[PDB]
Amino acid sequence: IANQPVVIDNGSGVIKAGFAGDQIPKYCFPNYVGRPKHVRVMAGALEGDIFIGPKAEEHRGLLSIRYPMEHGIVKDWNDMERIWQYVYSKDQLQTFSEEHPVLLTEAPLNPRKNRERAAEVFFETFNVPALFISMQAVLSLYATGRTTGVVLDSGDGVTHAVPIYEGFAMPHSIMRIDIAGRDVSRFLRLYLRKEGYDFHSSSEFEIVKAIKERACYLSINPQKDETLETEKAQYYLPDGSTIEIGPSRFRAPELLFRPDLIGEESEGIHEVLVFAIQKSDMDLRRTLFSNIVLSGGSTLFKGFGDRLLSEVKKLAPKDVKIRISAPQERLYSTWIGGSILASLDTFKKMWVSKKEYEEDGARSIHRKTF
């Protein structure tokens, strides 16, 4: 049966779920399982040891948070299975998994065993009619509505750049780095401890993430803002206590451009973008600089575009036109692409049916993956 396919954007920070044809994802919740750490004494107390989405956000203090996926790789599959079960539950989409096909969006250059185990869940545990795995970069092009462009998708878990020219994807020029939004949050936490504010609890780390999102700007010149006296912007905690972030505001986000700060022997985010273009053939290099598309949540930092363009301009060849286009719905671009791709009649040939998987097995996914 041709029931409308469900798009599931398995993001490190927030999972975006909805049916094909929908303009925006209806159901967006944080990607972690919260369990109560304190003992139950009352008879009318909160029922269940598992809290997902808004119930976990409301009763956060009671729960111990544990992310099942790290750098876009599922560490705990039991927890990951429960989150997909929650997508189908009465709280989220409220539909049968046996009726609707699924469109999954994984990061590039993941282990083969990761896709195999993930697929097993949707064919064996869930009797899904058909499953299609798609690239994050390719979907972003459907959302933007451009055949030619470099898609720099800097997420919470992983940052990668995929150059795609007039529909064609160069698989050898794809660059992936483990350092992402979650690493900046940990790096900021180190500066809060130096100031004298301790956030040991899993719940308290979520407040540090909120502080970063609220008050954190990217310096255009680090030496200028290092020398100049920084304005101590106060943040109010749930209890009422105020914290002055001060110079740590701009020192935390610098990690993206200088991974040596955390102490990782890797290239900076600005090198990843330019290097990926330089790997491409001479003819396409000038057009790839012309068509640069920003995506992911880690691009939302104040002055991100201004700093990135300055760093790319220095690394890029002389007298070349560099046009970096940022969609206003940076976070939702990937899912929007998924809905557009899923709505197409060609999608019927693209996915792998339940019966097709049972006959051939994992091999079918590996052939069609890229």
Partner: peptide, 24 residues
């Protein structure tokens, strides 16, 4: 857009495109 405006994570009061100067 008023359709996407309902969402919490929308960019507002930001330039759409960052580009280099045409003039040297």
């Amino acid at each position: 857009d008023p359709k996407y405006a309902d969402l919490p994570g929308i960019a507002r009061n930001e330039p759409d495109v960052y580009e280099t100067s045409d003039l040297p």
